[PDB]
Structures are given as C-alpha cells and as structure tokens.
C-alpha cells in the first residue's frame, strides 16, 4: 500500500491547476476528467476513513 499511496501522490501532483480549470482550458479539463475516471472518490473516502 506504500506503492498505491505513492501512485496517488504522483497523480495528485500531476493534476491540473485551479486557474486553468476556471479559464476552461480544454486539455486541462480533459486531464482532470481522465484522472477522475481513473481514481474514484469513494475509494479515497473509504481509505481515509
């Protein structure tokens, strides 16, 4: 699980920026959507819990 924690950290650091998201850059929105599809929210909530 250190492997998966490091992978999650790498994905989070690879996630786009809030100003780009607000400006609506298509590539940034696509990257955030891809990361969203790869990692579900429920898994994060449960492993936090």
């Amino acid at each position: 699980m250190s492997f998966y924690a490091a992978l999650i950290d790498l994905l989070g650091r690879c996630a786009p920026e809030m100003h780009l998201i607000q400006a609506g850059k298509g590539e940034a929105l696509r990257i955030r959507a891809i990361l969203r599809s790869l990692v579900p929210l429920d898994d994060l909530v449960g492993i936090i819990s």
């Binding site: 298509g26 599809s37 790869l38 579900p40």
Partner: protein, 49 residues
C-alpha cells in the same frame, strides 16, 4: 473527396439514423471500470464524436 491518412480526425454518420458515432460517458460494463460505452449522438458539437 479527401484522402484519409494516419494521424487524422474523422467523423462518422450513421446512414439510417443520420446521427453521429460518438463515445458515451456511460459505462454499462461492470467487468471493467475504465471501459466506456460507444453510441450515437444527434449533435456534431464537441470532440466526443
């Protein structure tokens, strides 16, 4: 007529339905979490088609 070559974007229109082939965001296949269903959409807007 434009000759089709690799690394080019194309648009496919169903003959009978006059709709456009696209990649839907719904995933009915529970076997794969990353899988996405492909279907028809009635609008040419966006990059999904």
């Amino acid at each position: 007529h434009r000759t089709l070559l690799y690394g080019h974007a194309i648009l496919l229109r169903h003959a009978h339905s006059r709709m456009y082939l696209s990649c839907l965001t719904t995933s009915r296949s529970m076997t794969d979490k990353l899988a996405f269903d492909v279907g028809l959409q009635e609008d040419a807007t966006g990059e999904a088609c």
